[PDB]
Design a protein around this ligand. Structure first.
Ligand SMILES: CCCCCCCCCCCCCCCCCC(=O)OC[C@H](CO[C@@H]1O[C@H](CO[C@H]2O[C@H](CO)[C@H](O)[C@H](O)[C@H]2O)[C@H](O)[C@H](O)[C@H]1O)OC(=O)CCCCCCCCCCCCCCCCC
Ligand SMILES: CCCCCCCCCCCCCCCCCC(=O)OC[C@H](CO[C@@H]1O[C@H](CO[C@H]2O[C@H](CO)[C@H](O)[C@H](O)[C@H]2O)[C@H](O)[C@H](O)[C@H]1O)OC(=O)CCCCCCCCCCCCCCCCC
Ligand code: CLA
Ligand code: CLA
Ligand code: CLA
Ligand code: CLA
Ligand SMILES: CC(C)=CCC/C(C)=C/CC/C(C)=C/CC/C(C)=C/CC/C(C)=C/CC/C(C)=C/CC/C(C)=C/CC/C(C)=C/CC/C(C)=C/CC1=CC(=O)C(C)=C(C)C1=O
Ligand SMILES: CCCCCCCCCCCCCCCCCC(=O)OC[C@H](CO[C@@H]1O[C@H](CO)[C@H](O)[C@H](O)[C@H]1O)OC(=O)CCCCCCCCCCCCCCCCC
Ligand SMILES: CCCCCCCCCCCCCCCC(=O)OC[C@H](COP(=O)(O)OC[C@@H](O)CO)OC(=O)CCCCCCCCCCCCCCC
Ligand SMILES: CC1=C(/C=C/C(C)=C/C=C/C(C)=C/C=C/C=C(C)/C=C/C=C(C)/C=C/C2=C(C)CCCC2(C)C)C(C)(C)CCC1
Ligand SMILES: CC1=C(/C=C/C(C)=C/C=C/C(C)=C/C=C/C=C(C)/C=C/C=C(C)/C=C/C2=C(C)CCCC2(C)C)C(C)(C)CCC1
Ligand SMILES: [Cl-]
Ligand SMILES: [Cl-]
Lengths: 55, 148, 144, 44, 188, 449, 34, 240, 99
């Protein structure tokens, strides 16, 4: 938790599996990412004036 | 139901609107992203910027020192004058052997003067800042004579 | 109280639009109107800064056949969106939530309650079988 | 202004002493305690 | 059960990052990661692709039968842009408001043209091209880049390609994909 | 070697069998130093080999080179890396030096005598011999003081450290007027650790840094002479445990705190850790983003001054609780951030919209844009990105690595302090092994309830 | 509200002093036996 | 602290002091205003520091007249309009026009009135067009919605971006709750402000005086009725 | 007894408690999962839901968590549930300011 407090997030394997031509083969990790996006776009509905949540 | 209004802002790109995007293009070399390569390539543009810094150091700054506006004076240094050191270096690089060496020497003597004046502003010493600024002006003029 | 009647949602083009019904797994489901082909042609956009399927721009009108609103046509964006939200919950019926002062939230049927209670009892009784059965098998050790 | 505040937040004041009393009380309390500890058990 | 040996110690199939696509009288190199989309946002949509994650990054190829045999026949590029403004979208919000910074009264969305061009293919047909950044009061994605290019095919049909990229992704590499596909777009 | 039957310590506690072996203990410590120097040299040469001049050091995941760069080596105006050979010299020097230390440790661990007191009395030492212990501390205290003065010398002589706040652009500057005012030098020590004060992490001027090292350097050397010519006083002897494990516990606790302070320094400080080499700080990245959009929108035609946001607290600019004008948005938390690229636009009262409206220099923009993209946010597999991001960028802020690593190191060493300190106190009492089984104190205590 | 600050500052100092001077009170000798 | 005195202090010296939330004082100059040359002048460095925030409120009695009541600010400072540029002119007579153009013309402020009631209001003089004499330059100013259309409520319902319906209660998603749902009215209101020039410094071209303005309070996007907020304070500007 | 105020005095009871706590907890959670199977869940408190709807300003961490759940469902249903074949136009998806 302390390391993640310094922005050291956990393993990120989003779009890690790619086919021959380059099409992205989604995985369980990608599905977890889909949920993470939902929580992110909702948290602090009016507390973000810029896209990146660097804070 | 209203159509989204459209505005012709093509002029923004002319006024360095892509500076941020270029600086954020990791594909570009770091020097290109920082604009270092561009400036080193544009000698006339660099020389112009140098003269702009000279004006700020000469026909300016003294005002704040007179009214003890230290914050503004110290911010007067750096800002546009921020690239002065890089600019003087590339102009001196244009010189060769002794010419370049002598020019670099003048650049160093001037850089030292600007730091002395800045420390005077830090100690908020108007008398020291005044005299120090005059010394800095002479130093810059000498470096300008060589680099230009 | 009664049935308002079938709600027919049609775009300005005249294409019949079908309101996607709310899946049971979803407590709240976004309102979407799709053509027979299955292509979303209209919806209530969460962001209206530059919508491309807004009920207004699509110009969707709801006409009720049969029921209380039989022959009633609605073009008011608000009115159409209101019926669209009901349509996604299935047939639109009139409800008196005053006599019982309903809270506006759905409840489970006796069917669901019976299943929940008996499944719970069953799972617990499993522990009962293991406990009493273990005592019978290890009566000598449990003896005391 | 509309109200009155210490205006000490964000200022790096030693031990948050924005008034001489604060500084004096801290040293006084410690001195009394030291005297008690030394008198009860001599240090050296 | 084709006995294809695994590509152990083999060579990558495609690393270009773009997969060549061919349509009805139009051809372009779609971004490899982008997946097919099934949403007809506008009338005459022929090809519709979207990024694997952010749907804001999408590409639409609209083909409309037009009597004019030249994109110039439509008029000045500015005039044509006005006629194709529908792509930018429409503000459904109608509430009167003046608490939106950087936006005119009662306006919650603003599109800014930042570039216009008329490229020509080897065949010779010209291509009315426009680059615009649409901003919203919510400021989602820090703005949506809009690359719009149009031309009339030999089939006397107007072909329009509109690529949208969220500013966030735009300055994070997505621009390279968008530019590649936009330049790849060719109408016969 | 040694066996548990003769020491009572198992293999998992073998190094504890060297507590009374001064000679062997020397070899162990000397050898460990060889390992430290080895990594310093090996990793440095590895970084130099894996370094590329087309990218900033932070993008190349380099941690050692930034340190040498800050010392003002192979760097130029704007932090641009002129040459890397100086870095190569450092790696070579450390690597060869590690060999010498390694040989000494091996010798003092094999051929060298297990004890020294019997032969070399000066080196010979016995825990509890406070006089000797204090003398040993003195010698090392003087060494550290000399090291700090070496840095001070490099600052005012033999070139200068890189100054990110240098006038007319950031570059190496020879400190000529180091702060010696005690109030300023010790002010940081009494500063609150909370926001704004930032305790000693607030140091933003190299003059104070060099001046502070001047103070610590002298005090340490003087303290060493004091401990060399003084013995612990009665109060100290009656309030401290005199044993090797106790002495180690004291060092473990101290070094643990130092680790936590270093983590915060790397995460907040931008002066001692130039953002040019170490990358932008968390607050710096946030402020950079606000500046990037503020500039872009203003050019498009937006009045950032009167731009009310959705909450009505200002979309681009607002007022700090104190009153200073600050960037709007969630970055309000980082309103106390100070960077060489934003200071020029600031004034007595927060930011100066005048500078923001006109006088904004291109570099002030380019730098902010680069920092915004290279924010400290990252993943363990080094997939650069705020979060919920695709695997496209391969970058993790070096600041994040140092902050996370040293924090964890500090935590463990603090736990080590608790373990060694408690065991040392119990050992002195005599109940470290356990209860007597015949003199159980509880059995003699009141029956309580 | 300075009175509140003065009070808190004194209260804190007092307790902190008890802790420091208390451990200075030959705490190591508090061992049950030796 | 005069303007020059503030300029002398560094940002760090000012940081934490709170002086940044205070308008400069025209200690120099003359109380007389006649010296003020007649003409148009840039109203640069125009600052408005609210001395007090009073809210009109009916008297204790149920029919008690609604008088302004004293209140306690809950938002640490952050309420002083500053860095505002505009156009100010003066005729040979008392004729004086004060027109605000841009700058930090707005400042959200949440104050608690007696009885533990927090009344939030956006202190602002946006689009002020005062046209009275040198003193009492009466004028009207815009009062934009405290919250923007994008602003989402706890339920998520909002103007440009929002559910618009009570998604929580599906059966009651659309009903009398209309006042709170699908309303989110962000229409701007108007307020009256009066400015008076106490002193004029002709040599330094600086003017300072008192300001008085009564503006509506937050309407919660139409959810609640607005409340009159009488804000009185001092104003400083440099005519250059 | 002095540090925590209470302490076990029977080794048997201590170990019996060590095995009872974990087993009891797992069985409790199992009953909860049984309810979720039938969708009988404690999703939200109607009392606060009604208050939040009638009083827009009223807000609690409970209401905030409700909004998060709304995003998770809308921003994963398309893929997590491919059988539903749900194509949500980006405009219909719930997104907060910026982000
Ligand atoms: C079993 C555990 C995993 C073993 C993996 C072994 C290889 C490895 O490790 O894998 C990583 C690398 C080898 O792989 C390379 O790892 C690199 C990691 O990024 C680094 O390099 C990148 C290059 O673009 C960037 O510069 C980035 O900023 C920088 O951090 C890149 O991803 C390269 O593409 C990749 O080839 O080895 C290394 O790093 C070796 C690391 C040695 C120890 C480092 C300690 C760091 C701090 C630890 C304590 C704090 C927090 C711990 C949290 C948990
Ligand atoms: C100490 C504990 C409380 C820390 C409080 C805090 O706000 O923490 C942060 C502070 C630093 O504060 C920040 O310090 C910053 C320093 O940067 C400033 O100065 C820099 C100079 O380069 C730059 O100019 C930069 O832009 C500028 O903002 C600023 O002053 C900020 O305003 C200020 O908030 O830490 C510090 O002061 C250093 C404190 C010592 C290290 C403590 C690390 C954590 C220790 C244990 C954690 C685990 C505990 C387990 C239980 C026991
Ligand atoms: C920094 C790591 C480190 C260091 C410096 C030491 C050092 C030492 N340990 Mg030790 N130990 C360690 C880690 C370490 N240990 C760990 C992790 C464990 C747990 C497994 C142990 C468990 C342990 C036990 C149980 C014992 C020691 C003992 C000793 C001492 C003598 C070793 C011995 O008797 O035979 C020496 C060992 C060898 C000769 C085998 C090879 C070792 C050589 C010296 C290493 C050289 C490698 C390097 C490449 C050589 C460079 C040459 C140069 C020209 C380049 C010695 C001072 C012994 C002791 O003195 O107890 C009182 C003892 O009994 N250790
Ligand atoms: C310079 C610091 C230092 C020193 C000199 C010592 C010295 C000693 N410790 Mg110790 N310790 C320390 C720090 C230190 N410790 C810290 C920070 C912690 C907290 C984690 C501990 C926790 C600890 C425990 C719990 C114990 C000791 C014990 C001992 C004694 C037995 C030595 C031994 O185990 O034999 C040989 C050496 C080993 C067996 C070590 C094996 C190698 C380890 C286990 C592998 C770890 C690799 C690690 C994951 C790499 C990453 C490290 C870092 C980046 C996180 C010995 C005198 C033992 C004792 O009885 O005390 C008297 C014991 O029980 N220590
Ligand atoms: C903490 C550092 C340290 C310390 C305290 C000592 C201390 C000591 N060393 Mg030594 N040494 C060190 C580092 C250190 N060494 C290193 C890094 C090397 C590698 C070059 C050596 C190589 C070395 C040798 C070759 C010898 C000593 C010897 C000695 C002993 C007597 C020195 C002497 O000249 O008289 C004699 C003494 C106790 C001598 C000895 O007999 O060892 C006990 C001796 O022969 N050392
Ligand atoms: C790693 C650095 C270090 C360490 C480990 C010590 C350790 C110690 N010092 Mg010390 N000292 C240091 C640096 C250090 N000092 C410096 C830099 C100075 C110069 C300002 C001094 C000046 C100093 C004096 C004047 C005295 C000590 C004393 C002491 C001893 C009493 C316990 C104590 O903590 O002091 C004090 C108690 C607390 C901090 C609690 C102790 C063993 C005392 C002593 O025992 O005489 C030798 C003593 O009077 N030190
Ligand atoms: C204004 C106010 C008051 C505000 C507060 C509001 C607030 C925070 C409200 C929350 C209230 C609250 C507590 C809510 C939690 C509700 C909840 C989750 C209930 C669960 C109930 C339940 C039956 C759960 C099933 C699982 C279960 C059985 C768990 C039991 C957990 C449990 C009690 C474990 C032990 C906890 C504990 C502290 C143990 C101490 C043991 C002990 C005394 C050690 C001493 C000891 C140890 C030895 O080894 C030896 C040898 C000896 C000799 C010895 O003695
Ligand atoms: C690793 C581990 C973590 C620590 C690492 C090292 C950290 C060092 C931080 C040093 C901070 C030095 C602060 C000096 C004192 C100070 O500033 O006080 C004052 C500060 C700030 O206090 C404020 O200051 C303002 C002006 O600066 C104003 O005056 C405010 O009115 C005032 O309240 O408050 C504190 O930090 C003191 C908190 C602790 C008070 C005593 C608690 C003792 C608790 C236990 C003692 C056990 C023994
Ligand atoms: C600094 C001190 C910190 C204080 C924390 C509070 C202490 C809690 C003590 C209450 C124990 C209650 C049982 C008494 C009955 C009792 O004395 O127990 C009896 C038992 C003693 O063992 P015996 O030998 O009596 O065993 C015989 C048994 O089989 C029954 O006869 O002690 C324990 O079980 C210790 C475990 C207590 C677990 C502590 C509870 C932890 C949380 C409690 C709930 C928290 C709610 C918070 C809400 C705000
Ligand atoms: C005692 C003991 C131990 C161990 C210890 C140790 C740790 C030792 C070490 C020691 C050491 C510490 C060693 C090291 C060595 C090193 C060296 C000897 C180096 C060399 C170098 C060289 C030879 C060169 C190189 C180069 C250069 C620099 C330049 C470039 C190139 C190159 C890289 C090639 C143990 C644990 C087992 C336990 C038991 C006992
Ligand atoms: C370089 C520099 C500087 C300076 C710094 C310094 C000056 C530092 C020091 C610091 C310090 C100053 C340290 C010390 C520490 C010590 C301590 C903190 C103490 C402790 C104590 C103890 C640990 C004890 C305890 C106890 C008691 C009393 C009771 C009984 C028991 C016992 C004894 C245990 C500056 C700032 C400019 C910044 C830049 C750089
Ligand atoms: Cl939230
Ligand atoms: Cl933000």
């Amino acid at each position: 938790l302390s390391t993640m407090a310094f922005n050291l997030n956990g393993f990120n394997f989003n779009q890690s599996v790619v086919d021959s031509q380059g099409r992205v083969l989604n995985t369980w990790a990608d599905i977890i990412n889909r949920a993470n996006l939902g929580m992110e776009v909702m948290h602090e509905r009016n507390a973000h004036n810029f896209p990146l949540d660097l804070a | 139901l209203t159509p989204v209004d459209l505005f012709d802002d093509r002029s923004v790109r002319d006024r360095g609107f892509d500076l941020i995007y270029e600086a954020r293009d990791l594909d570009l070399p770091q020097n290109v992203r920082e604009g270092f390569t561009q400036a080193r390539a544009s000698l006339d543009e660099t020389k112009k910027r140098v003269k702009e810094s000279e004006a700020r150091i000469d026909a300016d700054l003294d005002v704040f020192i007179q009214k003890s506006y230290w914050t503004e004076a110290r911010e007067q240094l750096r800002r546009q004058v921020g690239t002065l050191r890089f600019d003087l270096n590339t102009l001196a690089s244009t010189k060769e052997k002794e010419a370049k060496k002598a020019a670099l020497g003048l650049r160093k003597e001037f850089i030292q003067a600007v730091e002395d004046l800045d420390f005077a502003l830090r100690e908020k010493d108007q008398a020291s800042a005044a005299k120090k600024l005059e010394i800095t002006k002479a130093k810059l003029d000498s470096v300008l004579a060589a680099v230009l | 109280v009664g049935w308002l009647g079938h709600a027919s949602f049609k775009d300005q083009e005249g294409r019949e639009l079908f309101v996607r019904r709310m899946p049971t797994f979803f407590e709240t489901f976004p309102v979407l109107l799709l053509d027979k082909d299955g292509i979303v042609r209209a919806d209530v956009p969460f962001r209206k800064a530059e919508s491309k399927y807004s009920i207004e721009q699509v110009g969707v009108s709801v006409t009720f056949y049969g029921g209380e609103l039989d022959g009633l046509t609605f073009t008011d964006p608000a009115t159409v969106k209101k019926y669209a939200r009901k349509a996604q919950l299935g047939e639109i019926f009139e409800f008196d939530r005053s006599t019982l002062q309903s809270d506006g939230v759905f409840r489970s049927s006796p069917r669901g309650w019976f299943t929940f209670g008996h499944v719970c009892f069953a799972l617990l009784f499993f522990f009962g079988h293991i406990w009493h059965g273990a005592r019978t098998i290890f009566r000598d050790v449990f003896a005391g | 202004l509309v109200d009155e505040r210490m205006n000490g937040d964000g200022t790096g004041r030693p031990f948050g002493v924005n008034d001489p009393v604060l500084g004096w009380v801290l040293l006084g309390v410690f001195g009394t305690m030291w005297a008690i500890w030394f008198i009860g058990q001599k240090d050296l | 059960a084709y006995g294809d040996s695994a590509n152990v110690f083999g060579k990558v199939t495609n690393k270009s990052g773009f997969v060549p696509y061919a349509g009805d009288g139009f051809a372009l190199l779609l971004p490899a990661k982008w997946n097919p989309s099934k949403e007809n946002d506008f009338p005459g949509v022929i090809l519709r692709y979207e990024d694997n994650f952010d749907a804001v990054n999408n590409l639409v190829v609209i083909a409309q039968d037009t009597d004019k045999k030249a994109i110039a026949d439509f008029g000045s590029q500015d005039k044509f842009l006005e006629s194709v403004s529908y792509l930018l979208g429409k503000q459904a919000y109608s509430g009167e408001t003046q608490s939106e910074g950087g936006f005119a009264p009662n306006r919650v969305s603003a599109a800014s043209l930042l570039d216009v061009s008329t490229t020509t293919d080897k065949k010779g047909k010209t291509y009315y091209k426009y680059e615009l950044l649409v901003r919203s009061a919510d400021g989602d994605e820090g703005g949506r880049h809009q690359l719009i290019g149009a031309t009339v095919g030999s089939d006397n049909k107007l072909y329009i390609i509109k690529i949208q990229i969220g500013d966030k992704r735009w300055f994070k590499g997505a621009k390279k994909e968008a530019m590649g596909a936009f330049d790849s777009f060719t109408v016969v | 070697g040694r066996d548990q039957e003769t020491t009572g310590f198992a293999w998992w506690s073998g190094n504890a069998r060297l507590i009374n072996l001064s000679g062997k203990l020397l070899g162990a410590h000397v050898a460990h130093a060889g390992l430290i120097v080895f990594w310093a040299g090996a990793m440095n040469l590895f970084e130099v080999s894996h370094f590329v001049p087309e990218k900033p050091m932070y993008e190349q995941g380099l941690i050692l080179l930034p340190h040498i760069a800050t010392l003002g080596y192979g760097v130029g105006p704007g932090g641009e890396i002129i040459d890397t050979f100086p870095y190569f010299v450092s790696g070579v020097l450390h690597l060869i030096s590690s060999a010498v230390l390694g040989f000494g440790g091996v010798y003092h661990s094999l051929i060298g005598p297990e004890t020294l007191e019997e032969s070399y009395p000066f080196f010979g030492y016995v825990w509890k011999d406070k006089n000797k212990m204090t003398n040993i501390l003195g010698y090392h205290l003087i060494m550290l003081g000399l090291g700090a003065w070496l840095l001070v010398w490099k600052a005012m002589y033999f070139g200068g450290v890189y100054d990110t706040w240098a006038p007319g652009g950031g570059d190496v500057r020879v400190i000529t007027n180091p702060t010696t005012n005690a109030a300023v030098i010790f002010g940081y020590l009494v500063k609150s650790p909370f926001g704004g004060d930032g305790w000693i992490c607030s140091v933003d001027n190299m003059e104070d840094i060099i001046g502070g090292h001047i103070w610590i350097g002298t005090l340490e050397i003087l303290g060493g002479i004091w401990h060399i010519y003084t013995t612990p006083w009665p109060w100290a002897r009656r309030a401290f445990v005199w044993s090797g494990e106790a002495y180690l516990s004291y060092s473990l606790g101290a070094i643990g705190v130092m680790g936590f302070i270093a983590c915060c320094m790397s995460w907040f400080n931008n002066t001692a850790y130039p953002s040019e080499f170490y990358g932008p700080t968390g607050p710096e990245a946030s402020q950079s983003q606000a500046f990037t959009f503020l500039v872009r929108d203003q050019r498009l035609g937006a009045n950032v001054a009167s731009a009310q946001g959705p909450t009505g607290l200002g979309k681009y600019l607002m007022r700090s609780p104190t009153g200073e004008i600050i960037f709007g948005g969630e970055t309000m938390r980082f309103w106390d951030f100070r960077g060489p690229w934003l200071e020029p636009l600031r004034g007595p009262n927060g930011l100066d919209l005048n500078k923001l409206k006109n006088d904004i220099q291109p570099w002030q923009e380019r730098r902010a844009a680069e920092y915004m993209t290279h924010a400290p946010l990252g993943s363990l597999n080094s997939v650069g990105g705020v979060a919920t991001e695709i695997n496209a960028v391969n970058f993790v802020s070096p600041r994040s690595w140092l902050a996370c690593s040293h924090f964890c190191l500090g935590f463990f060493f603090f736990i080590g302090h608790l373990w060694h300190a408690g065991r040392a106190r119990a050992a002195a009492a005599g109940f470290e092994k356990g209860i007597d089984r015949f003199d159980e104190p509880v059995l003699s205590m009141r029956p309580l309830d | 509200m300075l009175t509140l600050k003065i009070f808190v500052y004194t209260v804190v100092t007092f307790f902190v002093c008890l802790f420091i001077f208390g451990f200075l009170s030959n705490d190591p000798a508090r061992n049950p036996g030796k | 602290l005069t303007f020059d005195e503030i300029q002398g202090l560094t940002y760090l010296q000012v940081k934490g002091s709170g002086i940044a939330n205070t308008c400069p004082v025209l200690e120099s100059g003359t109380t007389n205003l006649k010296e003020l040359k007649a003409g148009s002048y840039k109203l640069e460095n125009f600052c408005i520091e609210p001395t007090s925030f009073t809210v009109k409120e009916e008297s204790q009695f149920k029919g008690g007249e609604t008088e302004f009541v004293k209140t306690k600010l809950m938002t640490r400072l952050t309420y002083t309009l500053d860095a505002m540029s505009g156009s100010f002119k003066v005729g040979s007579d008392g004729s004086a026009e004060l027109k605000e153009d841009d700058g930090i013309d707005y400042a959200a402020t949440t104050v608690q009135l007696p009885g533990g009631e927090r009344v939030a209001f956006l202190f602002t003089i946006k689009q002020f067009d005062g046209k009275g004499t040198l003193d009492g330059i009466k004028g009207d100013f815009l009062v934009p919605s405290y919250r923007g259309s994008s602003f989402l409520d706890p339920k998520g319902r909002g103007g440009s971006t929002g559910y618009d319906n009570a998604v929580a209660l599906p059966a009651r998603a659309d009903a009398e709750e209309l006042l709170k749902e699908n309303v989110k009215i962000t229409k701007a209101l108007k307020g009256s402000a009066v400015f008076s020039v106490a002193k004029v410094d002709p040599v330094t071209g600086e003017i300072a005086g008192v300001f008085e303005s009564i503006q509506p309070s937050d309407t919660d996007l139409g959810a609640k009725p607005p409340k009159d907020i009488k804000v009185t304070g001092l104003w400083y500007a440099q005519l250059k | 007894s002095q540090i925590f105020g209470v302490a076990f005095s029977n080794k048997r009871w201590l170990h019996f408690f060590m095995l009872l706590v974990p087993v009891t907890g797992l069985w409790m959670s199992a009953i909860g999962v049984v309810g979720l199977a039938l969708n009988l869940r404690a999703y939200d408190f109607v009392s606060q839901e009604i208050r939040a709807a009638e009083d827009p300003e009223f807000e609690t961490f409970y209401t905030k968590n409700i909004l998060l759940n709304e995003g998770i469902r809308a921003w994963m249903a398309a893929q997590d549930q491919p059988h539903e074949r749900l194509v949500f136009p980006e405009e219909v998806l719930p997104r907060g300011n910026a982000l």
